[PDB]
Amino acid sequence: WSVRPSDVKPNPNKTMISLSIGDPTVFGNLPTDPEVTQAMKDALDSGKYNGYAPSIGFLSSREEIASYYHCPEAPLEAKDVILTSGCSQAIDLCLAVLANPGQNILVPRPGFSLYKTLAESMGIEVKLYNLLPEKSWEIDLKQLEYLIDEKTACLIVNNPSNPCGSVFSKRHLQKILAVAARQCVPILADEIYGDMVFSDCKYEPLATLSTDVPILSCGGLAKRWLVPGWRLGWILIHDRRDIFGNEIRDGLVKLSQRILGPCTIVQGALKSILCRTPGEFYHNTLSFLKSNADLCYGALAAIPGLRPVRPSGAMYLMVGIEMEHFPEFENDVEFTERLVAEQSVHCLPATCFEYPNFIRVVITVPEVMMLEACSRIQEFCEQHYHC
Amino acid sequence: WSVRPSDKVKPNPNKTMISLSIGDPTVFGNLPTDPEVTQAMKDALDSGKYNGYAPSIGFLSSREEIASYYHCPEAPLEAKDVILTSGCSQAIDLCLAVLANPGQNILVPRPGFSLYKTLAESMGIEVKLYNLLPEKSWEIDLKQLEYLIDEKTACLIVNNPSNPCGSVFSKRHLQKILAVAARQCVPILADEIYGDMVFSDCKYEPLATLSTDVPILSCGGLAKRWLVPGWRLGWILIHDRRDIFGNEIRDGLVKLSQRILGPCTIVQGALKSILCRTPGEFYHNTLSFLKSNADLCYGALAAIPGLRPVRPSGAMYLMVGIEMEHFPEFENDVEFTERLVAEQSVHCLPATCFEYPNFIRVVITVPEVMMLEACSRIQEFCEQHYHC
Ligand SMILES: *Cc1c(COP(=O)(O)O)cnc(C)c1O
Ligand SMILES: *Cc1c(COP(=O)(O)O)cnc(C)c1O
């Protein structure tokens, strides 16, 4: 017999407030629209969506996604859509089809930690490119271009960003594409937060700005429809000039037949989710995020020693910590641990996203909980701040 | 730019096609799931409590329910021994991932469900094949089984009841299989998606209720027994013995699960009512339909000269031997099934698909009148091509 695997307590009299949980559902203040719920119930009542779909998804479901995201600058037919078990599987399929062991991918820093996790598990090297906190978390284009070599199979771009809450300008997206053009590298666009911008930027999908650069774009229901548990995502294949060709398409189909795709009830409900979910839902969501973002940025900005970077989208912001003014702490991990011990407020240390001396805060908590949290954080910082 | 990827017959146009080859038992509408299954999902939806992220291995309460439903003292399960998956397919995948590295091997049955080969060989695990015996109700060749396992053999796959064979191993034979792996010290991945779907004079014992010293990862799910394969919910039941798996494998399973992040939370939330409220008569009526159709199909094709079916006790299929010497025109089961489509518009799956030539698989889940028609067409076809 030799069976082996393959290769700080919170302050007890202050009630815990977590600003670290990356799930918009958790406090019940962001339920999905009733129409979303109804579409699932309708799909269930039909009895049509209980049998096996093809691995890449029902044709009609793929057709509905294609026609929901198609535009002349980035056309999509059903054949350009693969439905997946959440965006995470979408990202995983794209990486597994583009990159072999030994090849590298370029990942943002700070960045959603899934990319590094999926890639390093599959033997894929990860090169980290910086985002600039003083330029609205824009990509350091000079470093990005430098980092690309002959082993680079793929470039990961996440816009709008978790953990940054940034929304890249049109110009900056164009400048990102140009780098990818010159170095002849495809892009995996993680656009799970697409259309979730609450600022006076507008959202452009990356593919709608590309002419020469082939893009695999990943999205899903998780965040915009506030049903992350439902496990439905998708890959939008945005080929240019036959660079992906039939081969990447076929490879995606093959790799998809492994797990067999997402829950068929969610695929059946997708038509009515996209067609009947009112504009008010998306608007009320974005209005709540923005005013929570104003309260948070505003409260944290007033605190000596913190440097919040205002978000324009998604469901977070990053806060810089001026460590010189907090001598007793060595990094963001110590800071956040002490904050829990003294104030029972959990913020996520950005060392989790490969970016020390920052923290991420979610802006999806009820506003009265955001208010209380920031207040507690002001007291903590006041009590530990040194000039 | 070097973006490279990583490392037919027309049916008789006069006769309406009858497919006996489709793995989906629901495709014809004669096997809907129970209303309580549907209601449980609707209730889960109305609650608004199952829309957020669950742990990758599944909600504690959902896992508790599965643990509770399959527990018995001879094979105990608590919530920690359960991992909810995106269909039984992923369950089987995760089990093979955690148990075996690129270079190691696994024992797979023949005829065997083809997923075991596709999964293993795609992540670099080499597959070795062990025989099932048609003349002994598709029982495992025990002598060959105990041979062929190297010291590199990471795992033994047992599928019972069987797709494609429709067999249900006896308590005796299951103990005999356990006895092999124990004294040869190799763990069992038990695919029991068809568990409790037995319709003849054999009881269903889950492989682990009979283990004592052989540690088993059992894979099941809602797909077949609750007739909702598309819903993508399965599970792993860890039946460790003597801490042979230990925390390492448990933790290996847990890490790997955090990759995909598990099955739809609505199905997880509905699991309690699905297991608790689905009536006994639903399972019974399903098995009554299956038995009737098995009798009709078995009887029909036995009567046909040149065909030797092996009668099933469970699951949703049976295998039919083709007496190739009485059909000179044909070489393979592939040609036989191709001409059958050409002449009679009946599609049977040639068993070459399952690495077992000169046999065919037939689904016993098509409506009875469709089975009747298909069988009489097959009779005529065989009569028209039979020699001697
Ligand atoms: C949530 C998230 C995902 C994963 O989404 P799921 O559909 O739940 O798998 C991918 N990328 C980013 C940036 C996310 O925040
Ligand atoms: C159908 C089947 C499976 C796959 O089950 P899913 O839950 O649909 O993934 C696994 N094993 C056997 C023997 C099957 O017939």
Ligand 1 within 6 A of CB of A112? yes
Instruction: Please name the amino acid found at residue A383.
Output: Q
**CATH, range A34-277:** 3.40.640.10
**CB of B193 closer than 8 Å to CB of B113:** no
DSSP string, A341-364: HHH-EE-EEGGGGT-TTEEEEES-
Which residue among A2, A226, A248 places its CB closest to the CB of B3?
Answer: A248
CA distance A213 to chain B (A): 10
Give nearest CA residue, ligand 2 atom 8: B229
Taken as a whole, chain B contains a residue count of: 388
Query: Which method resolved this structure?
Result: X-ray
Taken as a whole, chain A contains a residue count of: 387
Pairing of strands B188-191, B216-221: parallel
- Taking the C-alpha atoms of residue B335 and residue B78, their distance in angstroms, rounded to an integer, is 50
**CB of B208 closer than 8 Å to CB of B218:** yes
**CATH, range A8-33+278-387:** 3.90.1150.10
Residue ranges per domain, chain B? 8-34+279-388, 35-278
Residues closing a segment before a gap in chain B (C–N exceeding 2.5 Å)? 7
Q: Which residues of A49-60 are buried (b: 16+ CB within 10 A; e: fewer)?
A: bbbbbebbbbee
- Taking the C-alpha atoms of residue B219 and residue B88, their distance in angstroms, rounded to an integer, is 6
Pairing of strands B346-347, B18-19: parallel
Interface test mutation site (partner B, options A44, A112, A213, A225, max chain B beta carbons within 10 A): A44
Say what the alpha-carbon torsion angle B328, B330, B333, B336 is, to the nearest 10 degrees. Answer: -110
Distances (CA, A) of A247 to A63, A262, A315, B2, B286: 21, 23, 36, 12, 43
Cβ partners under 8 Å of residue B252, min gap 6: A5, A6, B97, B98
**CB of A382 closer than 8 Å to CB of A325:** no
**CATH, range B8-34+279-388:** 3.90.1150.10
Inter-chain touch B87–A260, beta carbons under 8 Å: yes
B286 CA → ligand 1 middle, Å: 40
Ligand 1 within 6 A of CB of A118? no
Q: What does the DSSP 8-state code read for residue A112?
A: -
Tokens 């991990």, located at residue = A333
- Taking the C-alpha atoms of residue B9 and residue B11, their distance in angstroms, rounded to an integer, is 6
Atom of ligand 1 nearest to the CA of A314: 15
Residues pairing with B159 in the sheet: B191
CA terminus-to-terminus distance, chain A: 62
Report CA torsion sign: B241, B247, B253, B258: positive
Q: Hey, is the C-beta of B45 within 8 angstroms of any chain A C-beta?
A: yes
Inter-chain touch B87–A25, beta carbons under 8 Å: no
Atom of ligand 2 nearest to the CA of B23: 1
**CB of A163 closer than 8 Å to CB of A361:** no
Q: What does the DSSP 8-state code read for residue A49?
A: S
Which residue among A40, A244, A258 places its CB closest to the CB of B93?
Answer: A258
Which residue among A5, A50, A186 places its CB closest to the CB of B33?
Answer: A50
**For residue A352, how many other CB atoms are within 10 A of its CB?**
16
**CB of B342 closer than 8 Å to CB of B10:** yes
Name the H helices within A30-108: 34-46, 59-69, 86-98
- Taking the C-alpha atoms of residue B290 and residue A151, their distance in angstroms, rounded to an integer, is 55
Pairing of strands B307-310, B317-322: antiparallel
- Taking the C-alpha atoms of residue A305 and residue A386, their distance in angstroms, rounded to an integer, is 9
- Taking the C-alpha atoms of residue A346 and residue B71, their distance in angstroms, rounded to an integer, is 38
Ligand 1 within 6 A of CB of A318? no
- Taking the C-alpha atoms of residue B305 and residue B249, their distance in angstroms, rounded to an integer, is 51
CA angle, B143 as apex, B141 and B148 as ends, to 5°?
95
- Taking the C-alpha atoms of residue B11 and residue A68, their distance in angstroms, rounded to an integer, is 37
**CB of B386 closer than 8 Å to CB of B327:** yes
Nearest to A83 by CA among A231, A227, A262, A254: A262
Distances (CA, A) of A162 to A109, A196, A217, A379, B254: 11, 12, 16, 27, 24
- Taking the C-alpha atoms of residue A35 and residue B18, their distance in angstroms, rounded to an integer, is 39
- Taking the C-alpha atoms of residue A381 and residue A302, their distance in angstroms, rounded to an integer, is 11
Distances (CA, A) of A202 to A25, A110, A309: 25, 22, 18
Report CA torsion sign: B58, B61, B63, B69: negative
Resolution (A): 2.3
Residues pairing with A152 in the sheet: A104
Tokens 């980035």, located at residue = A74
Q: Which residues of A71-106 are buried (b: 16+ CB within 10 A; e: fewer)?
A: eeebebebebbbbbbbbbbbbbbbbbbbbeeebbbb
Burial of B7 (C-beta count, 10 Å sphere; 0-12/13-18/19+):
exposed
Cβ partners under 8 Å of residue A281, min gap 6: A33, A35
Tell whether omega for the bond before A133 is within 30 degrees of 0, i.e. cis: no
- Taking the C-alpha atoms of residue B111 and residue B130, their distance in angstroms, rounded to an integer, is 9
Q: Answer left, alpha or beta for residue B24, where phi above 0 means left and psi between -120 and 50 means alpha.
A: beta
Name the H helices within A136-237: 141-147, 170-183
- Taking the C-alpha atoms of residue A220 and residue B106, their distance in angstroms, rounded to an integer, is 36
Tokens of B296: 């009709």
Cβ partners under 8 Å of residue A95, min gap 6: A105, A115, A118, A119, A122, A124, A154, A188
Which of B 71-90 lie inside 8 A of A, CB atoms?
86-87, 89-90
- Taking the C-alpha atoms of residue A282 and residue A206, their distance in angstroms, rounded to an integer, is 21
- Taking the C-alpha atoms of residue B347 and residue B339, their distance in angstroms, rounded to an integer, is 10
Which residue among A3, A26, A86 places its CB closest to the CB of B52?
Answer: A26
**CATH, range B35-278:** 3.40.640.10
Nearest to B251 by CA among A5, A208, A315, A14: A5
Can you give chain B as a three-state secondary structure string? CCCCCCCCCCCCCCCCCEECCCCCCCCCCCCCCCHHHHHHHHHHHHHCCCCCCCCCCCCHHHHHHHHHHHCECCECCCHHHEEEECCHHHHHHHHHHHHCCECEEEEEEECCCCHHHHHHHHCCCEEEEEEEEHHHCCEECHHHHHCCCCCCEEEEEEECCCCCCCCCCCHHHHHHHHHHHHHCCCCEEEECCCCCCECCCCCCCCHHHHCCCCCEEEEEECCCCCCCHHHCCEEEEEECCCCCCHHHHHHHHHHHHHHHCCCCHHHHHHHHHHHHHCCHHHHHHHHHHHHHHHHHHHHHHHHCCCEEEECCCECCEEEEEECHHHCCCCCCHHHHHHHHHHHHCEECEEHHHHCCCCEEEEECCCCHHHHHHHHHHHHHHHHHHCCC
- Taking the C-alpha atoms of residue A175 and residue A185, their distance in angstroms, rounded to an integer, is 14
**CB of B96 closer than 8 Å to CB of B106:** yes
Inter-chain touch A7–B101, beta carbons under 8 Å: yes
DSSP string, A193-211: TTT-B-SSS----GGGG-S
